[PDB]
Amino acid sequence: PEFKKLGLPDKVLELCHRKMGLILVTGPTGSGKSTTIASMIDYINQTKSYHIITIEDPIEYVFKHKKSIVNQREVGEDTKSFADALRAALREDPDVIFVGEMRDLETVETALRAAETGHLVFGTLHTNTAIDTIHRIVDIFPLNQQEQVRIVLSFILQGIISQRLLPKIGGGRVLAYGLLIPNTAIRNLIRENKLQQVYSLMQSGQAETGMQTMNQTLYKLYKQGLITLEDAMEASPDPKELERMIR
């Protein structure tokens, strides 16, 4: 799918012009996150002549050979463990790597190093919120290593998209998303571990301006008659905040 059909705003695609660092796209089962990822990489494919390496449990979409060079590796027939395959792409030196899933410490740690030594890294997680995303990434590490991981993220995190697909009208289903594309202020707060204040700053990014909470995105979809009230409440990672909004 064309990134313009995604229902996501333009600044998410600017992320693909970043030269290194980590981009995360998350959400529950059948959240459409692979479809977002694939639309964003296929943009790259069409626009830049890069070397692109993919690592997917089953590959979920096959990429056309356009401007870029894309190697898509299924953990299993091609290789075996995400970790294994990741460190193998790493030495290969590509411009972009997509790591289908970081279930593991080893995968996650390799992803972080790739992102810091000159590569653009896409990954997916099943977390529901930009905030939970950060906690899953850090918390999987041993206590004594989390300050470390937290501040690496503060410098190398490029963006995280939390998605949900809702029913209704307009085009079919609609994409509901949360979005956190750190700026100097949230970088700092991640550093100090002020994740509560990071959220308050997402509430300020009006109709985007780099940041946008899920609850807001549900609110505007609802306010445009794009989903129903019940659907919105059902999908909110904090119904109390949306209900306060509605009033």
Query: What region does 7 belong to: left with phi over 0, alpha with psi -120 to 50, or beta?
Result: left
**CATH number for the domain including 6?**
3.40.50.300
- What resolution does the deposited structure have, in angstroms? 1.9
Distance, CA of 195 to CA of 94 (rounded, Å): 32
Contacts of 194 (CB under 8 A, 6+ apart): none
- The span from the CA of 184 to the CA of 192, in Å, is 13
Handedness of CA 14, 37, 221, 157 (dihedral sign): negative
How far apart CA 135 and CA 91 sit, in angstroms, is: 29
The beta-carbon contacts of 222-231 under 8 Å, at least 24 apart in sequence, are 222/246, 225/169, 226/168, 226/169, 226/170, 226/174, 227/166, 227/167, 227/168, 227/174, 227/176, 228/168, 231/166, 231/167, 231/168
CA distance 126 to 136: 10
Question: HEC profile for 66-134?
Answer: CCCEEEEEEECCCECCHHHHHHHHHHHCCCEEEECCCCCHHHHHHHHHHHHCCCEEEEEECCCCHHHHH
Taking the C-alpha atoms of residue 29 and residue 174, their distance in angstroms, rounded to an integer, is 16
**How many structural domains does the chain have?**
1
Closest C-alpha to 202, from 224, 221, 220, 183: 183
Block residue for tokens 């690496």: 152
Q: What residue type is assigned to position 9 of the chain?
A: P
Entry field: residues in the chain = 247
In which residue are the tokens 């308050």 written? Answer: 200
